[PDB]
Design a protein around this ligand. Structure first.
Ligand SMILES: [Zn+2]
Ligand SMILES: [Zn+2]
Ligand SMILES: [Zn+2]
Ligand SMILES: [Zn+2]
Lengths: 37, 115, 38, 97
């Protein structure tokens, strides 16, 4: 069955969110460096 | 200037949804409380509707967004935003459109976990 | 059923990939400024 | 330091696996083509196997990454490692041809 598939996709999705988040953070650090100069 | 508020709210909502044990009351109400704000951040300031073609001001960090069919038209939040005023600050912010789609699909999934 | 759930989740994933790609593009645009100035 | 390689490869790989066109013959083979390059970009340059714990140096575009043990952490990379793991889990789980 495609039961576990759903669970996997959820986990991937959550991780991807984690990424998107860290990426936003890093965009902040970059905009900070640029604004600093 | 990327849609910071909207992405943040998306992360919140998405998380609550994907960590919700369908049936459980607390997470559910938390979702229901949080969701309109995420919806609000993706609403056109002239329509009230969900951005049908997102245009963001290259102008400012003020984060007010409109449909493409909502150029030069009267915005709703009174007092009006100072930074918004200049209208030729048209940019098709992709991140916005994506987030709009994201929200739609999220609602779809939610209604599924509800029914 | 849960197959429609699955498909929905797939669609979300794809969107999230697009988003990630976008962020990457912006980040690269930022580092371009950083190496230029520093 | 921003990991361009790992992210780009993760994106394309995922895109392929997930946007699998079951009426395309090149469908499987392209996944298989990309997969090792992707796996590699996330492997330690002293360990050999996939990054155990990610450490990258400041603002070096040489893009080489190594385990915490093998001698500044990059959280993006750690996430990406997990992304590979989970993606592989999905791959093994589903049929692609
Ligand atoms: Zn509108
Ligand atoms: Zn404004
Ligand atoms: Zn190592
Ligand atoms: Zn090196």
């Amino acid at each position: 069955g495609a039961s576990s598939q759903a669970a996997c996709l959820k986990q991937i999705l959550l991780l991807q969110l984690d990424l998107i988040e860290q990426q936003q953070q890093q965009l902040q650090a970059k905009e900070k460096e640029i604004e600093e100069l | 200037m990327n849609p910071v508020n909207a992405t943040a709210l998306y992360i919140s909502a998405s998380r609550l949804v994907l960590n919700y044990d369908p049936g459980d009351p607390k997470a559910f109400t938390e979702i229901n409380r949080l969701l309109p704000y995420f919806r609000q951040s993706l609403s056109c300031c002239v329509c009230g509707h969900l951005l049908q073609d997102p245009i963001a001001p290259t102008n400012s960090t003020c984060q007010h967004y409109v449909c493409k069919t909502c150029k030069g038209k009267k915005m709703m939040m009174k007092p009006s935003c100072s930074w918004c005023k200049d209208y030729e600050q048209f940019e098709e912010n992709k991140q916005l459109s994506i987030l709009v789609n994201c929200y739609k699909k999220l609602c779809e999934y939610i209604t599924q976990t509800t029914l």
